Write a protein that binds this ligand. Structure first.
Ligand SMILES: CCCCCCCCCCCCCCCC(=O)O
Ligand SMILES: *[C@H]1O[C@H](CO)[C@@H](O)[C@H](O)[C@@H]1O
Length: 151
């Protein structure tokens, strides 16, 4: 159902922007890291939910493919902003001693995001599939950048 996927993608967007707020307020305190991690785990769950919902949906109509494609691609700048915000806080991450947690989260989120993109590509129109794939290459490149910073 396209509406469920759109709802799922909106929730993902909200999760990401909440996570960015946590990053921007992070001063290297472990309780802050824990609070942020709770949001990150909600985000993982919400991405996986979207993947499950996409896998349960049949080939999208033209308008539904456009809606889902634009909703997925609309995530891109918020993702980049979020990754930039945690990258900006590397000194505080290292001070807190939680670099491996950030790295583990980045790897899990990239894998889950890639699975979601694959599931949406499979039900999109042929043209939208190419658009989603190109956008996903950019998302993957941003993940790879953040991962490099933290390893
Ligand atoms: C489509 C998903 C996009 C996600 C982009 C943001 C990825 C952030 C991953 C790092 C999470 C780290 C959370 C706990 C550690 C901390 O905040 O101090
Ligand atoms: C690679 O991309 C990440 C995510 O946007 C940046 O934070 C990093 O500085 C580098 O440009």
């Amino acid at each position: 159902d396209a509406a469920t996927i759109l709802s799922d993608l909106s929730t993902i967007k909200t999760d990401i922007n909440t996570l960015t707020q946590h990053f921007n307020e992070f001063t290297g305190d472990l309780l802050q890291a824990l609070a942020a991690q709770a949001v990150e785990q909600q985000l993982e769950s919400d991405i996986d939910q979207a993947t499950a919902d996409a896998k349960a949906t049949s080939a999208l109509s033209a308008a539904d493919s456009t809606s889902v494609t634009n909703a997925l691609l609309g995530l891109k700048p918020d993702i980049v902003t979020s990754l930039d915000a945690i990258v900006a806080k590397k000194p505080q991450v290292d001070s807190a001693g939680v670099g491996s947690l950030v790295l583990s989260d980045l790897n899990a989120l990239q894998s889950k995001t890639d699975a979601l993109s694959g599931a949406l590509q499979d039900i999109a129109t042929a043209t939208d599939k190419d658009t989603i794939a190109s956008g996903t290459q950019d998302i993957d490149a941003a993940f790879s950048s953040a991962i490099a910073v933290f390893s």
